DNA sequence: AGGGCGCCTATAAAAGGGGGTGGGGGCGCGTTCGTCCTCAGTCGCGATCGAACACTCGAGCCGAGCAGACGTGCCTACGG
């Protein structure tokens, strides 16, 4: 069971952006630093570097505190996107080798980590203890390789995928800076985890598929929803000219369709016009707009059309998404192909050009016929466990490489 | 107790059975070989079932056009 930030949650901006053009989709998940253009940072010149030591202690304690004075048990503290800050709160770091990830979270989103551990034979004393995680033992393994007799593998675990990862050290020479309009602060920060390939567990949808289209549509009307809510006119009133600003690839007709059953058109004398909500119309509660769109389906839709941009940027057009080697490649196949396979409904390449790094040591996710009928099964499993071994020994691993010259 | 007289030894030849010994043939029984049958396995042929592909129909979405309303500008008429 995951629970989400509030800020997750309820779909706010800008933890989830309401349109993304093909700048931002090329720079999805790798904001580049902006400069600002007014507050203190948007000055010349050398600027603090902030310590956080005493607030770090400082927020530990208080949410402790509200701990204790309700009156102890399990507390909720990711209420408001203040909560969210890197500036409190203990830290790590998560490092993913894939370069595009099929499903990745959107900031204010949570994740477990859980510690798969697989039991010697006869007297098992338990799995060893690890910093961060909860052990999980498990007879059957979660991953496509299955896990040795006293074997522990961390993970990532949530509602878009499971993966596993590998806890390291932070170099000496690093910190992190984090960097407002105000002011720059630093912490200190030891844990960084490399993450392995996703296994994903949510499917991502095709490009004009029904799916798609009905989750922007519902998306918007989510949108429209919450405008109408923080309205403070009464009766409340919203402008087009805010939903087209945030849905700019919308034609105003399309939006026109959402707003009819619950708004009005109010026309005035000047270029600005209000759609004001019929007063016979009820507005959907906090907890009925939650439910029709997920922090999870936002982030399926994204990595659709962040892949489709990056599709179309390497010269393969819409007839395209038989099949080109690197249509393979994007989310909807992949993870349609890995989650049919989970279901048993199929096998997979797992040796192909769907292989994310390129050398062998991750999984091309890509549909083979379950179609001696031991032995085909047999060599599947054998395949998945090499591949599987290869990575927990390549990415857990501290050897130091050693720069290609090339 | 001893002399003579009986028998043995050797020679030829015939008569005919009968008896004895050895070899061959015939007859009967058993063994071996061949043929047939049965069983099992494999291959081929035919029929039936399942899967895949194609076609058709319906629904939905999008776009374009038209109408209405509002605002602004220009011209004409009315009022002071």
């Given at each position: 069971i995951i629970q989400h930030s509030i800020p997750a949650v309820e779909l706010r901006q800008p933890f989830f952006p309401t349109h993304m053009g093909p700048i931002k989709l090329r720079q999805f998940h790798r904001p580049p630093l902006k400069k600002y253009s007014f507050g203190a940072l948007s000055q010349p010149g050398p600027h603090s570097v902030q310590p956080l030591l005493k607030h770090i202690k400082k927020k530990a304690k208080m949410r402790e505190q509200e701990r204790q004075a309700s009156g102890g048990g399990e507390m909720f503290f990711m209420r408001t996107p203040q909560d969210?800050?890197?500036?409190?709160?203990?830290?790590?770091?998560?490092?993913?080798?894939?370069?595009?990830?099929?499903?990745?979270?959107?900031?204010?989103?949570?994740?477990?980590?859980?510690?798969?551990?697989?039991?010697?034979?006869?007297?098992?004393?338990?799995?060893?203890?690890?910093?961060?995680?909860?052990?999980?033992?498990?007879?059957?393994?979660?991953?496509?390789?299955?896990?040795?007799?006293?074997?522990?593998?961390?993970?990532?675990?949530?509602?878009?995928?499971?993966?596993?990862?590998?806890?390291?050290?932070?170099?000496?020479?690093?910190?992190?800076?984090?960097?407002?309009?105000?002011?720059?602060?630093?912490?200190?920060?030891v844990d960084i985890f490399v993450v392995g390939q996703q296994c994903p567990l949510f499917e991502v949808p095709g490009p004009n598929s029904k799916r798609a289209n009905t989750h922007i549509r519902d998306f918007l009307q989510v949108f429209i929803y919450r405008l109408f809510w923080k309205s403070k006119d009464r009766p409340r009133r919203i402008r087009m000219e805010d939903i087209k600003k945030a849905f700019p690839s919308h034609s105003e007709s399309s939006i026109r369709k959402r707003l009819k059953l619950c708004a009005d058109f109010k026309r005035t004398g000047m270029d600005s016009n209000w759609w004001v909500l019929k007063s016979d119309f009820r507005l959907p509660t906090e907890e009925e707009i939650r439910a029709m769109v997920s922090p999870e389906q936002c982030c399926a839709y994204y990595s659709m059309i962040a892949a489709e941009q990056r599709l179309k940027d390497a010269g393969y057009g819409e007839k395209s998404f038989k099949i080109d080697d690197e249509v393979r490649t994007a989310p909807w196949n992949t993870t349609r192909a890995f989650i049919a396979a989970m279901k048993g409904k199929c096998l997979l390449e797992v040796t192909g050009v769907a292989d994310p790094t390129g050398c062998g040591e991750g999984f091309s996710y890509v549909k083979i016929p379950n179609k001696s009928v031991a032995e085909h099964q047999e060599r599947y499993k054998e395949e998945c466990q090499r591949i599987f071994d290869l990575q927990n020994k390549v990415l857990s691993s501290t050897e130091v490489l050693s720069t290609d010259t090339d």
């Amino acid at each position: 069971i995951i629970q989400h930030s509030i800020p997750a949650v309820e779909l706010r901006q800008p933890f989830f952006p309401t349109h993304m053009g093909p700048i931002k989709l090329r720079q999805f998940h790798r904001p580049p630093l902006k400069k600002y253009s007014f507050g203190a940072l948007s000055q010349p010149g050398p600027h603090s570097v902030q310590p956080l030591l005493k607030h770090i202690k400082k927020k530990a304690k208080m949410r402790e505190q509200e701990r204790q004075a309700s009156g102890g048990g399990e507390m909720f503290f990711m209420r408001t996107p203040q909560d969210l800050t890197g500036k409190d709160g203990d830290l790590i770091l998560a490092e993913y080798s894939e370069e595009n990830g099929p499903l990745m979270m959107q900031v204010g989103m949570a994740t477990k980590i859980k510690n798969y551990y697989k039991r010697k034979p006869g007297k098992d004393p338990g799995a060893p203890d690890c910093k961060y995680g909860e052990t999980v033992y498990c007879h059957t393994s979660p991953f496509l390789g299955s896990l040795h007799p006293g074997q522990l593998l961390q993970a990532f675990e949530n509602n878009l995928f499971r993966a596993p990862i590998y806890l390291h050290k932070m170099p000496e020479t690093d910190f992190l800076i984090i960097r407002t309009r105000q002011g720059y602060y630093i912490r200190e920060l030891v844990d960084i985890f490399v993450v392995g390939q996703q296994c994903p567990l949510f499917e991502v949808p095709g490009p004009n598929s029904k799916r798609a289209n009905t989750h922007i549509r519902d998306f918007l009307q989510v949108f429209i929803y919450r405008l109408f809510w923080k309205s403070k006119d009464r009766p409340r009133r919203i402008r087009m000219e805010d939903i087209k600003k945030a849905f700019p690839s919308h034609s105003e007709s399309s939006i026109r369709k959402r707003l009819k059953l619950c708004a009005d058109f109010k026309r005035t004398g000047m270029d600005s016009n209000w759609w004001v909500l019929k007063s016979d119309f009820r507005l959907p509660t906090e907890e009925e707009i939650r439910a029709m769109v997920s922090p999870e389906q936002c982030c399926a839709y994204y990595s659709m059309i962040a892949a489709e941009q990056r599709l179309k940027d390497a010269g393969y057009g819409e007839k395209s998404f038989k099949i080109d080697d690197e249509v393979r490649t994007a989310p909807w196949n992949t993870t349609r192909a890995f989650i049919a396979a989970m279901k048993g409904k199929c096998l997979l390449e797992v040796t192909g050009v769907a292989d994310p790094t390129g050398c062998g040591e991750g999984f091309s996710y890509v549909k083979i016929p379950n179609k001696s009928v031991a032995e085909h099964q047999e060599r599947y499993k054998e395949e998945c466990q090499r591949i599987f071994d290869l990575q927990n020994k390549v990415l857990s691993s501290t050897e130091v490489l050693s720069t290609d010259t090339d």
